[PDB]
Amino acid sequence: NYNKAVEEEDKMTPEQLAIKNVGKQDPKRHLEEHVDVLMTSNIVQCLAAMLDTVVFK
Amino acid sequence: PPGGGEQEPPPPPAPQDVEMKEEAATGGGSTGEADGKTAAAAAEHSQRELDTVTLEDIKEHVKQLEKAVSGKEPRFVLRALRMLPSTSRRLNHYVLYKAVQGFFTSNNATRDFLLPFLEEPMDTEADLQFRPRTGKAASTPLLPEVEAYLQLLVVIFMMNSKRYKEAQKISDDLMQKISTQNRRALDLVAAKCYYYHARVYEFLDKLDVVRSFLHARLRTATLRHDADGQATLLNLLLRNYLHYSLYDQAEKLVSKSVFPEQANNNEWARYLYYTGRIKAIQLEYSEARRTMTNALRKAPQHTAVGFKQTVHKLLIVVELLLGEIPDRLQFRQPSLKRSLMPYFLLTQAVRTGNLAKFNQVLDQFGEKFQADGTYTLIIRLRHNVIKTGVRMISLSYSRISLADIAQKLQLDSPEDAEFIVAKAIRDGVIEASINHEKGYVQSKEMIDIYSTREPQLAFHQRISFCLDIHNMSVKAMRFPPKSYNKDL
Amino acid sequence: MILDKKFHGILDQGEGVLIIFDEPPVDKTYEAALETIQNMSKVVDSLYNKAKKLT
Amino acid sequence: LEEGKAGSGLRQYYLSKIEELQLIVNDKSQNLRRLQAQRNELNAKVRLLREELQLLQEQGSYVGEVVRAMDKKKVLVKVHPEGKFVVDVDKNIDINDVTPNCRVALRNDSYTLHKILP
Amino acid sequence: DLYSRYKKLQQELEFLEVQEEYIKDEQKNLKKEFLHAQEEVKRIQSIPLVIGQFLEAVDQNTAIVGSTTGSNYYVRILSTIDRELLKPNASVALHKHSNALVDVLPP
Amino acid sequence: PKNPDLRIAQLRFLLSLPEHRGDAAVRDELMAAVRDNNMAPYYEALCKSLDWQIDVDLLNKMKKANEDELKRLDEELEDAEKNLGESEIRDAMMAKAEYLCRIGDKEGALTAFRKTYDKTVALGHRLDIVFYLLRIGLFYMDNDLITRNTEKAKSLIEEGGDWDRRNRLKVYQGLYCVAIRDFKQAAELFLDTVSTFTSYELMDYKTFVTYTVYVSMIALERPDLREKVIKGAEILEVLHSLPAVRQYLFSLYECRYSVFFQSLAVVEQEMKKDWLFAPHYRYYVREMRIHAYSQLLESYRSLTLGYMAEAFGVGVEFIDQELSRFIAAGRLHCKIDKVNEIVETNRPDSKNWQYQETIKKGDLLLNRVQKLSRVINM
Amino acid sequence: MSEKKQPVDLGLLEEDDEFEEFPAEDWAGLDEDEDAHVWEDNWDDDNVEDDFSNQLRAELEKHGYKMETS
């Protein structure tokens, strides 16, 4: 929901990038937060193999 | 006399500026770009030169220029000749010789001065220093200009241009393997040469010369190549192997080597159509389907239209073998439309699969698809009709009747029903239960998908393969930003 | 009233069997698929910037 | 002859391709070290925010308002109540630029001016 | 020179080689340091704090703040907070000691 | 144009293809030949008409009054010319241009509506000229030519939804969405039918109902019909006009095939022989059959062929080849079996298929990031 | 290369020189009913259309006669 809730903001961005391209006015970056969201999402992947080890022995 | 006589010296004076500006822009851009360090900066003029070539493939250049416009033919590069230092008076000469033809007129002709094009390549091509890159940058663009209009005894003039090309650079080379940006240019440049008079080759001759040497020049690169130009030289070999080779103990799986980084953003598509065309004769159903449809979907840059009728036509030709034939659905262009304008009645005649009618229908208006050669996959189609139709029976119900569906398959006997249905059973593409309780043949016909049927093992491999593709795409967004921040 | 989905069930004429079942995790495929469709315009508009800047 | 020109010549060509490989190791070292300079400057930047953290421990700073400049380089400045603290402001800023009857930025203990304010 | 360029150059191959695992060590260590200083400046931001009120922003990333006591304070604001929170009539909240703003409150 | 010669000249399609109904259709065309300068339309479709005996009588009279009122619009235009005014020249050029719609020639009407299209003092008059191209573009059945001025007159309106201007354009959205087979975005267009009215410039109100009952009747489901129209009182007013329509809503919604197929022949014969409604008559039939079979087959897991044949009132031989064509061709559900001679579906389309609807977009995004890989380095 | 597009396009100009605007106008007889209608639907409609262009095209008029006979 935070991902898609930023994707509605990045929906508008390629018009801005399709107009100006000179100088940056937004302190919001939209990238590293979503990298962090992926890092928290990879807990599922890291703990799936943990489940595989517990299920193994 | 006033109509063309007044508008004659008007229209012309217009491609002169863009062609001279173009040869000064890519010539002085290439030499003035990689002059100091050619070895450091590489392939920056790769896309530039090919985009100028595809930019000049649609030239309406010579329509009237046989009559008294031929002053552009004896003129040439003439940059910084006869002495490598002290070129300031030659900087004067650059305006001088262009200004001599601009006072009154010039004595001009077309077909006389072709053979002494080697006057400067004997002593100094341009400068005596950058002789390779200025030699190919001088000679190689202008040879498709004069050797355009291949017909009308310019084939012999093309043979002169051949032996001049080999004689100065590609008999062996001037230094074997240049090992620079013009070596890497000379790969696809010499290739493009061999494609260009490959029309001269197949025009009267066939495989029996430069193509046989091109294996030795194909391996003279040492192997340490990225093999892009080596792959382009492989493409003329495989297209030479398209019309008649048919032997598979060399090129098929033998030619198949390392599979180098062969990209070009074209050569995946056309290389892949070539190997899919030759891999289309054993009727590949899994691989050539998806990857040849992929090669259809590649090359979007210049046209998606004019050439992909061939990978498209061959594609649907092998798609109707499997029983499920998708037509032209999502792409709208009236070239593939006219391409399938003969094919439409028969490709709609695939699915209903009426034997005696459609057998007459194919050969009936069969002109160009049956004049396309040797009736091979249509002659496999002629008895693939009942197999794709009985595959639609497999998409229909289980039990096989002796009157209803046997009459419906135009096939009226107890033996041949279970026999040819059993020929669909020995395929393995279906799911069926051979049972005789009273003589009627059952099938369980279970087309149940893996949804709640071993899902972990099923899209297990989908997860591994898909994540490998997405994560090598993550590599493909890691390394080109390294190629961004490399210069700065 | 199964067709108006007032409750969970599905009928039968040969066997007369009623089966009652439900699907609670509705919000996964929604947000997943809408994230795909919203990322479509990101990639395609990116290709409009890049198809602009190269050719 | 035909070895130093040809066999050691192509050995030297292979050395030139090795220079292409060190152009790959070269530019990877370039862009990875520019990324390294980026992380060095960014983590250095939040380290300079820790340098600002002592001025966070300052409890911020006050708002000076000069109503009258004094000619002894000791500017009387109207402060929030129990204020009116006459002081020399910092040495890197001149006194005459500070116009009277205008609001300025003043530290809360050291009483040194930062800038003129509207 | 010419044949000496080979073995002379091999040392440059090795010296450029040694920068590889070095830049690996830097790129693995300094991002760990980045989350060190990142978490350490994060744990400066603590929830017990004083609430002021915003009056004016006189330049970029530095502004003035009316305290609850009415005395106006001059604080360089923290860099992570964007320009939305530079609203002139806002419910700003600094720290009780650091007196830098973590968040503004909805009225 | 907006004349009734639009709708009389709209009968040429049913005049054309059967020889049966071409008697009354030529009757009101020959009777309407004296109206709205009808000369050039039936002279154009005169190959689709009778002989030349009585035809050459009235052409000589219409051709001269053509130039008489034409040159009175020309001299009246010149007296409107060289004088201070905008709407005088706009209306002189416009009445000239609608007169050129009466002769049926958009050569002089294209440049005439182009000139008064350049004399538009406001965008509302501009949209009026736009609609004056739409009403003859209906008879002319151009596609892009009449979507061009609605695309350009679409943006920058700023004057609010007017009462039958904006409503008239919304009706025209109903027109080209009857033309095109986009339906789920045609489902919003008839929602103004509270405000739609007898529009003799294009279309009668009861014919607007008669045409919107198809897109509602096929293109909408039971939450859609129960939401919009079964809730809505507008169809509750006009259902009393024809008793058939009430059967095609209540028996279809009641899922009674034995009467709906008995009456569906009237939808078939009605469905053809129509101007803008003809070429899709193959699609509405099949689409309505599969939508009905999905309507019954949704709430039903297993189904005998006895209650099914009783339900449809048809032999088992036809529903045999039906759903066999609707596995591959129609593509409704999972595989149906005849080992017990009983319709049995599985339909695991909720749990895992709810996730695997996205693998298509996963592969399409996969090839699109292969295209992103094709952007790399060239 | 894209210069091998040239003899394939010479083949295309021979295909366009087979019939000169006979198929564009006559097939435009179907395109004028088919233009701006989404041609993914025209493959389904063309599929069942060409399927029933042989026999039993409308056929819903016949099912009322199939009631008493079947």
PDB file of all heavy atoms in Angstrom, chain B residues 9 18 26 31 38 49 62-63 71 116 142 154 159 161 172 187 212 271 275 288 362 368 372 383 397 401 408 458 488:
ATOM      1  N   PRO B   9      19.004  23.499 -62.108  1.00  0.00           N
ATOM      2  CA  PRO B   9      20.094  23.820 -61.183  1.00  0.00           C
ATOM      3  C   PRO B   9      19.574  24.247 -59.813  1.00  0.00           C
ATOM      4  O   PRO B   9      20.333  24.805 -59.022  1.00  0.00           O
ATOM      5  CB  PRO B   9      20.783  24.997 -61.869  1.00  0.00           C
ATOM      6  CG  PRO B   9      19.682  25.686 -62.604  1.00  0.00           C
ATOM      7  CD  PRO B   9      18.666  24.638 -62.980  1.00  0.00           C
ATOM      8  N   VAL B  18      24.074  18.107 -47.244  1.00  0.00           N
ATOM      9  CA  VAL B  18      23.887  17.134 -46.174  1.00  0.00           C
ATOM     10  C   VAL B  18      24.846  15.958 -46.323  1.00  0.00           C
ATOM     11  O   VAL B  18      25.214  15.326 -45.326  1.00  0.00           O
ATOM     12  CB  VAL B  18      22.414  16.680 -46.107  1.00  0.00           C
ATOM     13  CG1 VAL B  18      21.507  17.874 -45.840  1.00  0.00           C
ATOM     14  CG2 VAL B  18      21.983  15.966 -47.376  1.00  0.00           C
ATOM     15  N   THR B  26      30.856  12.887 -39.651  1.00  0.00           N
ATOM     16  CA  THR B  26      31.226  11.567 -39.155  1.00  0.00           C
ATOM     17  C   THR B  26      32.686  11.260 -39.454  1.00  0.00           C
ATOM     18  O   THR B  26      33.327  10.483 -38.738  1.00  0.00           O
ATOM     19  CB  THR B  26      30.312  10.507 -39.762  1.00  0.00           C
ATOM     20  OG1 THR B  26      30.380  10.583 -41.192  1.00  0.00           O
ATOM     21  CG2 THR B  26      28.885  10.726 -39.306  1.00  0.00           C
ATOM     22  N   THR B  31      37.586  10.720 -36.722  1.00  0.00           N
ATOM     23  CA  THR B  31      39.013  10.975 -36.580  1.00  0.00           C
ATOM     24  C   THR B  31      39.275  11.957 -35.450  1.00  0.00           C
ATOM     25  O   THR B  31      40.098  11.696 -34.570  1.00  0.00           O
ATOM     26  CB  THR B  31      39.590  11.499 -37.893  1.00  0.00           C
ATOM     27  OG1 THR B  31      38.972  12.747 -38.220  1.00  0.00           O
ATOM     28  CG2 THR B  31      39.336  10.510 -39.011  1.00  0.00           C
ATOM     29  N   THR B  38      42.327   6.206 -29.653  1.00  0.00           N
ATOM     30  CA  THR B  38      41.333   5.353 -30.286  1.00  0.00           C
ATOM     31  C   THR B  38      41.071   4.122 -29.429  1.00  0.00           C
ATOM     32  O   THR B  38      39.937   3.637 -29.354  1.00  0.00           O
ATOM     33  CB  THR B  38      41.806   4.947 -31.687  1.00  0.00           C
ATOM     34  OG1 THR B  38      42.169   6.113 -32.434  1.00  0.00           O
ATOM     35  CG2 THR B  38      40.706   4.232 -32.452  1.00  0.00           C
ATOM     36  N   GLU B  49      27.685   5.176 -37.168  1.00  0.00           N
ATOM     37  CA  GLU B  49      27.898   4.752 -38.544  1.00  0.00           C
ATOM     38  C   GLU B  49      26.757   3.874 -39.040  1.00  0.00           C
ATOM     39  O   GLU B  49      26.308   4.019 -40.183  1.00  0.00           O
ATOM     40  CB  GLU B  49      29.244   4.044 -38.677  1.00  0.00           C
ATOM     41  CG  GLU B  49      30.417   5.005 -38.656  1.00  0.00           C
ATOM     42  CD  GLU B  49      31.749   4.300 -38.762  1.00  0.00           C
ATOM     43  OE1 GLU B  49      31.771   3.053 -38.697  1.00  0.00           O
ATOM     44  OE2 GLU B  49      32.774   4.996 -38.918  1.00  0.00           O
ATOM     45  N   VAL B  62      20.100   9.195 -56.414  1.00  0.00           N
ATOM     46  CA  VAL B  62      20.357   9.323 -57.843  1.00  0.00           C
ATOM     47  C   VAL B  62      19.094   8.943 -58.617  1.00  0.00           C
ATOM     48  O   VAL B  62      18.672   7.782 -58.649  1.00  0.00           O
ATOM     49  CB  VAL B  62      21.604   8.524 -58.268  1.00  0.00           C
ATOM     50  CG1 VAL B  62      21.625   7.088 -57.699  1.00  0.00           C
ATOM     51  CG2 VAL B  62      21.732   8.514 -59.787  1.00  0.00           C
ATOM     52  N   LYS B  63      18.451   9.956 -59.198  1.00  0.00           N
ATOM     53  CA  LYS B  63      17.315   9.744 -60.085  1.00  0.00           C
ATOM     54  C   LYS B  63      17.608  10.376 -61.444  1.00  0.00           C
ATOM     55  O   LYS B  63      17.254   9.815 -62.486  1.00  0.00           O
ATOM     56  CB  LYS B  63      16.017  10.286 -59.456  1.00  0.00           C
ATOM     57  CG  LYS B  63      15.952  11.795 -59.189  1.00  0.00           C
ATOM     58  CD  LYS B  63      14.636  12.215 -58.580  1.00  0.00           C
ATOM     59  CE  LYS B  63      14.573  11.794 -57.132  1.00  0.00           C
ATOM     60  NZ  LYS B  63      15.608  12.478 -56.310  1.00  0.00           N
ATOM     61  N   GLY B  71      30.006  15.348 -61.075  1.00  0.00           N
ATOM     62  CA  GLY B  71      31.219  15.911 -60.501  1.00  0.00           C
ATOM     63  C   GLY B  71      31.551  15.392 -59.118  1.00  0.00           C
ATOM     64  O   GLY B  71      32.717  15.462 -58.710  1.00  0.00           O
ATOM     65  N   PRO B 116      41.347   3.731 -61.426  1.00  0.00           N
ATOM     66  CA  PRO B 116      42.396   4.350 -60.603  1.00  0.00           C
ATOM     67  C   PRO B 116      41.881   5.000 -59.329  1.00  0.00           C
ATOM     68  O   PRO B 116      42.231   6.149 -59.047  1.00  0.00           O
ATOM     69  CB  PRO B 116      43.010   5.402 -61.538  1.00  0.00           C
ATOM     70  CG  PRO B 116      42.593   5.012 -62.899  1.00  0.00           C
ATOM     71  CD  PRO B 116      41.227   4.462 -62.705  1.00  0.00           C
ATOM     72  N   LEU B 142      31.953   5.155 -49.921  1.00  0.00           N
ATOM     73  CA  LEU B 142      31.676   5.531 -51.302  1.00  0.00           C
ATOM     74  C   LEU B 142      31.519   4.342 -52.236  1.00  0.00           C
ATOM     75  O   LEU B 142      31.101   4.528 -53.383  1.00  0.00           O
ATOM     76  CB  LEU B 142      32.772   6.467 -51.831  1.00  0.00           C
ATOM     77  CG  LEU B 142      34.276   6.147 -51.747  1.00  0.00           C
ATOM     78  CD1 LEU B 142      34.805   5.212 -52.843  1.00  0.00           C
ATOM     79  CD2 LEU B 142      35.054   7.459 -51.765  1.00  0.00           C
ATOM     80  N   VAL B 154      27.246  -3.228 -63.811  1.00  0.00           N
ATOM     81  CA  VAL B 154      27.969  -2.742 -62.641  1.00  0.00           C
ATOM     82  C   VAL B 154      28.386  -3.908 -61.735  1.00  0.00           C
ATOM     83  O   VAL B 154      29.183  -3.731 -60.800  1.00  0.00           O
ATOM     84  CB  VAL B 154      27.091  -1.678 -61.927  1.00  0.00           C
ATOM     85  CG1 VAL B 154      27.802  -0.910 -60.822  1.00  0.00           C
ATOM     86  CG2 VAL B 154      26.579  -0.675 -62.937  1.00  0.00           C
ATOM     87  N   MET B 159      32.938  -6.336 -59.100  1.00  0.00           N
ATOM     88  CA  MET B 159      34.103  -7.216 -58.975  1.00  0.00           C
ATOM     89  C   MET B 159      35.395  -6.410 -58.870  1.00  0.00           C
ATOM     90  O   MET B 159      36.302  -6.775 -58.107  1.00  0.00           O
ATOM     91  CB  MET B 159      34.154  -8.168 -60.170  1.00  0.00           C
ATOM     92  CG  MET B 159      35.176  -9.281 -60.071  1.00  0.00           C
ATOM     93  SD  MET B 159      34.743 -10.546 -58.871  1.00  0.00           S
ATOM     94  CE  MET B 159      36.361 -11.178 -58.450  1.00  0.00           C
ATOM     95  N   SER B 161      35.437  -3.447 -57.516  1.00  0.00           N
ATOM     96  CA  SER B 161      35.383  -2.898 -56.168  1.00  0.00           C
ATOM     97  C   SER B 161      35.722  -3.955 -55.128  1.00  0.00           C
ATOM     98  O   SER B 161      36.345  -3.634 -54.117  1.00  0.00           O
ATOM     99  CB  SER B 161      34.015  -2.283 -55.904  1.00  0.00           C
ATOM    100  OG  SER B 161      33.835  -1.159 -56.742  1.00  0.00           O
ATOM    101  N   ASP B 172      44.071  -9.907 -46.386  1.00  0.00           N
ATOM    102  CA  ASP B 172      44.611 -10.413 -45.123  1.00  0.00           C
ATOM    103  C   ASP B 172      44.429  -9.259 -44.120  1.00  0.00           C
ATOM    104  O   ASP B 172      43.910  -9.425 -43.017  1.00  0.00           O
ATOM    105  CB  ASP B 172      46.088 -10.772 -45.266  1.00  0.00           C
ATOM    106  CG  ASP B 172      46.974  -9.976 -44.329  1.00  0.00           C
ATOM    107  OD1 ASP B 172      47.058  -8.740 -44.494  1.00  0.00           O
ATOM    108  OD2 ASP B 172      47.585 -10.584 -43.426  1.00  0.00           O
ATOM    109  N   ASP B 187      35.152  -5.571 -38.769  1.00  0.00           N
ATOM    110  CA  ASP B 187      34.378  -6.802 -38.672  1.00  0.00           C
ATOM    111  C   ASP B 187      33.052  -6.679 -39.422  1.00  0.00           C
ATOM    112  O   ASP B 187      32.822  -7.369 -40.423  1.00  0.00           O
ATOM    113  CB  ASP B 187      34.117  -7.133 -37.202  1.00  0.00           C
ATOM    114  CG  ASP B 187      35.395  -7.333 -36.414  1.00  0.00           C
ATOM    115  OD1 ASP B 187      36.418  -7.700 -37.027  1.00  0.00           O
ATOM    116  OD2 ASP B 187      35.376  -7.128 -35.181  1.00  0.00           O
ATOM    117  N   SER B 212      34.136 -19.489 -48.554  1.00  0.00           N
ATOM    118  CA  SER B 212      34.995 -20.554 -48.047  1.00  0.00           C
ATOM    119  C   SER B 212      36.208 -19.992 -47.315  1.00  0.00           C
ATOM    120  O   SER B 212      36.704 -20.611 -46.368  1.00  0.00           O
ATOM    121  CB  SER B 212      35.429 -21.473 -49.184  1.00  0.00           C
ATOM    122  OG  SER B 212      34.328 -22.218 -49.674  1.00  0.00           O
ATOM    123  N   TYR B 271      19.613 -13.260 -36.507  1.00  0.00           N
ATOM    124  CA  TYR B 271      20.305 -14.504 -36.180  1.00  0.00           C
ATOM    125  C   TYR B 271      19.350 -15.557 -35.646  1.00  0.00           C
ATOM    126  O   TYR B 271      19.437 -16.735 -36.030  1.00  0.00           O
ATOM    127  CB  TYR B 271      21.406 -14.213 -35.157  1.00  0.00           C
ATOM    128  CG  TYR B 271      21.983 -15.407 -34.436  1.00  0.00           C
ATOM    129  CD1 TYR B 271      22.876 -16.266 -35.058  1.00  0.00           C
ATOM    130  CD2 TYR B 271      21.650 -15.649 -33.108  1.00  0.00           C
ATOM    131  CE1 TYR B 271      23.404 -17.348 -34.381  1.00  0.00           C
ATOM    132  CE2 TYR B 271      22.168 -16.721 -32.430  1.00  0.00           C
ATOM    133  CZ  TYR B 271      23.042 -17.566 -33.067  1.00  0.00           C
ATOM    134  OH  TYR B 271      23.557 -18.635 -32.381  1.00  0.00           O
ATOM    135  N   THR B 275      18.455 -19.254 -37.345  1.00  0.00           N
ATOM    136  CA  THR B 275      18.525 -20.553 -36.688  1.00  0.00           C
ATOM    137  C   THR B 275      17.144 -21.133 -36.388  1.00  0.00           C
ATOM    138  O   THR B 275      17.025 -22.346 -36.218  1.00  0.00           O
ATOM    139  CB  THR B 275      19.365 -20.466 -35.409  1.00  0.00           C
ATOM    140  OG1 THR B 275      19.538 -21.780 -34.866  1.00  0.00           O
ATOM    141  CG2 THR B 275      18.713 -19.580 -34.372  1.00  0.00           C
ATOM    142  N   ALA B 288      11.160 -23.234 -30.760  1.00  0.00           N
ATOM    143  CA  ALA B 288      11.125 -22.272 -31.861  1.00  0.00           C
ATOM    144  C   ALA B 288       9.830 -21.467 -31.875  1.00  0.00           C
ATOM    145  O   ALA B 288       9.780 -20.374 -32.452  1.00  0.00           O
ATOM    146  CB  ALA B 288      11.307 -23.002 -33.189  1.00  0.00           C
ATOM    147  N   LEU B 362      -6.293 -25.859 -50.855  1.00  0.00           N
ATOM    148  CA  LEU B 362      -4.876 -25.492 -50.788  1.00  0.00           C
ATOM    149  C   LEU B 362      -4.256 -25.337 -52.175  1.00  0.00           C
ATOM    150  O   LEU B 362      -3.793 -24.255 -52.559  1.00  0.00           O
ATOM    151  CB  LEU B 362      -4.113 -26.552 -49.992  1.00  0.00           C
ATOM    152  CG  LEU B 362      -4.446 -26.725 -48.510  1.00  0.00           C
ATOM    153  CD1 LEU B 362      -3.779 -27.968 -47.947  1.00  0.00           C
ATOM    154  CD2 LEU B 362      -4.029 -25.504 -47.729  1.00  0.00           C
ATOM    155  N   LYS B 368       1.549 -18.905 -54.686  1.00  0.00           N
ATOM    156  CA  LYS B 368       2.836 -18.426 -54.196  1.00  0.00           C
ATOM    157  C   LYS B 368       3.287 -19.189 -52.960  1.00  0.00           C
ATOM    158  O   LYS B 368       4.489 -19.386 -52.757  1.00  0.00           O
ATOM    159  CB  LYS B 368       2.766 -16.926 -53.902  1.00  0.00           C
ATOM    160  CG  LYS B 368       4.102 -16.298 -53.522  1.00  0.00           C
ATOM    161  CD  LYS B 368       4.007 -14.795 -53.368  1.00  0.00           C
ATOM    162  CE  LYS B 368       5.314 -14.223 -52.842  1.00  0.00           C
ATOM    163  NZ  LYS B 368       6.439 -14.390 -53.803  1.00  0.00           N
ATOM    164  N   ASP B 372       6.348 -21.431 -53.268  1.00  0.00           N
ATOM    165  CA  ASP B 372       7.411 -20.980 -52.386  1.00  0.00           C
ATOM    166  C   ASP B 372       8.455 -22.072 -52.229  1.00  0.00           C
ATOM    167  O   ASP B 372       9.597 -21.798 -51.846  1.00  0.00           O
ATOM    168  CB  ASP B 372       6.824 -20.572 -51.036  1.00  0.00           C
ATOM    169  CG  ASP B 372       7.732 -19.639 -50.255  1.00  0.00           C
ATOM    170  OD1 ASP B 372       8.810 -19.272 -50.762  1.00  0.00           O
ATOM    171  OD2 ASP B 372       7.359 -19.262 -49.129  1.00  0.00           O
ATOM    172  N   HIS B 383      -1.791 -34.295 -43.893  1.00  0.00           N
ATOM    173  CA  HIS B 383      -2.195 -35.320 -42.944  1.00  0.00           C
ATOM    174  C   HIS B 383      -2.019 -34.881 -41.498  1.00  0.00           C
ATOM    175  O   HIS B 383      -2.243 -35.683 -40.588  1.00  0.00           O
ATOM    176  CB  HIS B 383      -1.457 -36.635 -43.211  1.00  0.00           C
ATOM    177  CG  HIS B 383      -1.917 -37.330 -44.455  1.00  0.00           C
ATOM    178  ND1 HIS B 383      -1.373 -38.518 -44.890  1.00  0.00           N
ATOM    179  CD2 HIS B 383      -2.863 -36.996 -45.364  1.00  0.00           C
ATOM    180  CE1 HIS B 383      -1.964 -38.889 -46.012  1.00  0.00           C
ATOM    181  NE2 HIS B 383      -2.874 -37.982 -46.321  1.00  0.00           N
ATOM    182  N   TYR B 397     -15.096 -34.081 -25.791  1.00  0.00           N
ATOM    183  CA  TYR B 397     -15.422 -35.071 -24.773  1.00  0.00           C
ATOM    184  C   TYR B 397     -14.655 -36.383 -24.943  1.00  0.00           C
ATOM    185  O   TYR B 397     -13.894 -36.578 -25.894  1.00  0.00           O
ATOM    186  CB  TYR B 397     -16.913 -35.360 -24.818  1.00  0.00           C
ATOM    187  CG  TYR B 397     -17.751 -34.152 -24.519  1.00  0.00           C
ATOM    188  CD1 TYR B 397     -18.256 -33.366 -25.550  1.00  0.00           C
ATOM    189  CD2 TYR B 397     -18.017 -33.778 -23.212  1.00  0.00           C
ATOM    190  CE1 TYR B 397     -19.028 -32.262 -25.286  1.00  0.00           C
ATOM    191  CE2 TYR B 397     -18.791 -32.683 -22.938  1.00  0.00           C
ATOM    192  CZ  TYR B 397     -19.290 -31.922 -23.977  1.00  0.00           C
ATOM    193  OH  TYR B 397     -20.059 -30.815 -23.711  1.00  0.00           O
ATOM    194  N   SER B 401     -17.389 -42.444 -30.276  1.00  0.00           N
ATOM    195  CA  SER B 401     -18.484 -43.157 -30.901  1.00  0.00           C
ATOM    196  C   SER B 401     -18.030 -43.765 -32.217  1.00  0.00           C
ATOM    197  O   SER B 401     -16.982 -43.406 -32.764  1.00  0.00           O
ATOM    198  CB  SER B 401     -19.668 -42.221 -31.139  1.00  0.00           C
ATOM    199  OG  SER B 401     -20.725 -42.899 -31.791  1.00  0.00           O
ATOM    200  N   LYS B 408     -17.932 -37.819 -37.888  1.00  0.00           N
ATOM    201  CA  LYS B 408     -17.582 -36.408 -37.806  1.00  0.00           C
ATOM    202  C   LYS B 408     -16.120 -36.180 -38.156  1.00  0.00           C
ATOM    203  O   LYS B 408     -15.780 -35.170 -38.781  1.00  0.00           O
ATOM    204  CB  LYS B 408     -17.885 -35.878 -36.409  1.00  0.00           C
ATOM    205  CG  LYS B 408     -17.752 -34.378 -36.289  1.00  0.00           C
ATOM    206  CD  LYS B 408     -18.129 -33.903 -34.908  1.00  0.00           C
ATOM    207  CE  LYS B 408     -17.031 -34.242 -33.939  1.00  0.00           C
ATOM    208  NZ  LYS B 408     -15.822 -33.466 -34.298  1.00  0.00           N
ATOM    209  N   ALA B 458       5.589 -27.423  -8.994  1.00  0.00           N
ATOM    210  CA  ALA B 458       5.209 -26.940 -10.313  1.00  0.00           C
ATOM    211  C   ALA B 458       5.773 -25.557 -10.596  1.00  0.00           C
ATOM    212  O   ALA B 458       6.616 -25.413 -11.485  1.00  0.00           O
ATOM    213  CB  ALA B 458       3.696 -26.932 -10.462  1.00  0.00           C
ATOM    214  N   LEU B 488      33.038   9.753 -15.268  1.00  0.00           N
ATOM    215  CA  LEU B 488      32.985  10.861 -14.329  1.00  0.00           C
ATOM    216  C   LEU B 488      32.925  10.359 -12.890  1.00  0.00           C
ATOM    217  O   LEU B 488      32.604  11.110 -11.970  1.00  0.00           O
ATOM    218  CB  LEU B 488      31.779  11.757 -14.662  1.00  0.00           C
ATOM    219  CG  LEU B 488      30.368  11.151 -14.774  1.00  0.00           C
ATOM    220  CD1 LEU B 488      29.566  11.164 -13.469  1.00  0.00           C
ATOM    221  CD2 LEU B 488      29.582  11.821 -15.897  1.00  0.00           C
TER     222      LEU B 488
END
